[PDB]
Each structure stands twice: as structure tokens, then as C-alpha cells.
Symmetry: D2
């Protein structure tokens, strides 16, 4: 896994964030099991509860570009700092990457199964 | 100015991407953005049903991943290519990115989002 | 429908709002078909997309206190001003009140079916 | 200090309220708040699956409708009374109102929410 590449593509993805309500831009990038890279950014709504996370955008991209399984994902804020997915996104990503999906972390990337142990499903 | 045949067809193709193991109700959507490009989405269900993403939500994500802009028209269809009206959540999400004048495909005549979501919270 | 009563109970409900991220408190109150009144307030989350609307809280209350159908609902901000439900909530409320559910409005209360015409379902 | 028998039973009773016509998978939840009261919730599905509310979300709504406070312990169960682990969304929602030390019922030994959602976004 070229983490520098994934981090770069997530950082570039953060540029597209629609965040007029908090200004907290988030980008995400994932390697798919066919080698391709899909990306996404967050999209807020005036009704905060309808906001879509970057990682949710990544999973939409995954299925809109031929499906498959996610192998690795990096999520960053608009400054390029690595972020941990919210719990909603951990559940969403599990559906498409499983417990062995790697998630970027500033120290060492972690298995999703360790970030969401004994997951509902 | 909108090629609805093109949009409805693209939405129809988009629906084959749907991840819908729980209901098997595929949905695809396609929209024309104000620079002339078309973006598509399909729905993506989750084992926790409440984390399911609509096709129209996927469209809005694709919008912002591909340069942003404003939506001018959108078509939403099921797996059989039958035109669908967006759910209330998608009406509100779409209003954020195309406003009241966003046109929504409809079997008889496209409708303004403003008429599908009047007196919108904002 | 005693709208003054429903507006009062919604206003009182707004006091419980958990809104550290925008400070926009919302309360809601509904008359159920057995005569009882259920209430709710909004609950934000650090991940904005996990925020729960007041009207969502009302529907949870409905089912946690014996189920039934909603006949009328009033939604107000923390100042007691009537608010129109977001689209997500219109879809949610439709499930439990139908097209004929009345929703408070400053001029005249409206049928939900008019606020969400040709609804998905 | 937590009566888990009481919590699990209350969650079990709460699950009979569930609105679940699409999956028929009822869920009930009950939690002890820091003033000693117990709040309950059940899941509520929607025809647009993504608008489904979890029982744990219902609990957090009930928390704030009944005076607010902090959650100390929560039990979540299905319609048969079998203990369930919350979904990722509910883990994040619960973290907001009980923090890492919130205890989650489990068939062998209650777990800290911090262990079910480590390195949480915040
Ligand atoms: Zn997230
Ligand atoms: Zn929708
Ligand atoms: Zn709402
Ligand atoms: Zn849940």
C-alpha cells in the first residue's frame, strides 16, 4: 500500500468539501481490489443530520465505478492531517472492506476490525 | 435545454451499480450540473438500515468530487428504469445544491424541486 | 386540535435540545390518535451527519410509549417560532401520520401531503 | 453499581415497541443515566431505509427529553432478548453522551464504549 499516494489523493479530495456550516473539510481516498483509487469529500446540509461524510462519498464512488472491495483508506482534514473515521463510517466501510481493511493512522495504519471490534452485522 | 432522454438513460445505467442486498430495490440517479457535465449515483444499503445512502446522495457526493457547481436537472429511476420521486431526505439534500428551480424527472412532466418540497426548512 | 397547547409543549421541549455545535435548539410536540402528546428535541453529534431532529425524537417517543398514529405536530425553535420540518423529517413523519397529518405553520397549519407531495414510498 | 438484570429486562420490554415492518428485526435498548433514572428506546424503520432510527438513537433522544445528563450504562437486545453490540453510528452517538467509560451490556461481561470505539473521531 502506497500510503503517501492515498494520503495525497485524500488531501486533494478535501479541496472539494462542501462545508459552509463548520468549515471542517475532509477528504478520503481508497485503494480498491482492482488497483484503482476512488475518492470523496464531505458534504454538509443545513439540516446537520443529512450531512454526508467523505468515507460515505468513497463508498458511493466505489459502486458508481464498478464495485469491488476496499483494501486501504486514508482520511485527512483540509490541512492534510490524518483523521479517524467516525463510527457511522466505520460501519459503512466494514460493509465494503471487512475487518481487514486498513485505515491510515499517523503512527501506524490499523485494521478496521480493531477500530470497530465485535461489530454489529 | 435539458436532454431528459440522456439523463434518464444515464440514471438507468447507474442503477446497475447499486449495492442493495437487503431489499434488492436498486436505484440510479443522474444529474446535469451547471457547467454541462453529468454526474451519476446509485444507492448503497448497509446492514444497519439507517446507514443506507440514496442514489441522489451519491450524486451530490459525485458533484463535489468532480469540481462542484450547481445541479440544474436530475433523473431518478429504479432497476426497471421506472422514474422515481426522491425521498424527503434527498429532497432536502438536493435543495442545497440546486435550489427550488432544480428540475426532477417525472413520467408526465419534470417538476421543480420547489413544488416537491414547498416551504422548505432552511 | 389545540395548537396553542402543542406549540407550548414543543417550546418547552426545545429546552432539552443538545446543540453545542450550532446552538439552534428545536422542540416538537405531537398529538397521537389516543389523545396523548409526545415530544422531542434535537440532539447534535460531533459528526454532524449523526444529528437527530426533534421530529425524529417525536417518532421514537411515539413508539416507546405505545405506538399509534400522529394527528398533528408543531415544531418550534428555542424562541418559540414555528419551524417547518426538514425533508428527512417529512419522510419520517409521513410513515407515522400519513398525508393528512397536520403540521403547524405561522399562517395556517398544512397537510403533510402538501408539504411532501407525490412522496416516495 | 449497575443492575444489568434490570437494564437488560427493560431493553427487552422496550423492543416490543419496535416499528420494523421491512426487516422484522426488533431492537430495544435501555440506559441508566447519572441521576439514577432509566430511559428506553426501540428502533423505527422507514420506507427509505436510510432514515431508520436505531434503538440506541431513541435512547439518546429520550435522555434529552427527560432532563438530560450523562449515560452510565446501556443494554441493547433483539426481539428474542439476545444482547446486541451497537452499530458504528450508535457507538459514535453514544460516545457523545456517555464517553469512553459508558458500559455496554455483553453476554459475558459489559464492555467500555472506549474499547468498542477506540481512537474515536472527535
Ligand atoms: Zn463519518
Ligand atoms: Zn432518498
Ligand atoms: Zn429534520
Ligand atoms: Zn445503530
Amino acid at each position: 500500500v502506497d500510503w503517501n499516494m492515498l494520503r495525497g489523493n485524500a488531501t486533494q479530495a478535501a479541496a472539494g468539501a462542501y462545508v459552509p456550516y463548520s468549515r471542517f473539510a475532509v477528504g478520503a481516498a481508497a485503494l480498491v481490489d482492482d488497483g484503482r483509487v476512488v475518492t470523496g469529500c464531505n458534504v454538509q446540509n443545513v439540516s446537520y443530520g443529512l450531512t454526508l461524510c467523505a468515507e460515505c462519498a468513497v463508498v458511493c464512488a466505489l459502486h458508481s465505478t464498478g464495485g469491488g472491495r476496499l483494501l486501504a483508506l486514508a482520511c485527512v482534514d483540509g490541512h492534510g492531517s490524518v483523521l479517524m473515521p467516525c463510527g457511522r463510517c466505520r460501519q459503512v466501510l466494514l460493509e465494503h472492506g471487512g475487518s481487514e481493511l486498513l485505515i491510515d493512522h499517523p503512527v501506524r495504519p490499523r485494521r478496521l476490525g480493531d477500530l470497530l471490534p465485535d461489530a454489529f452485522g
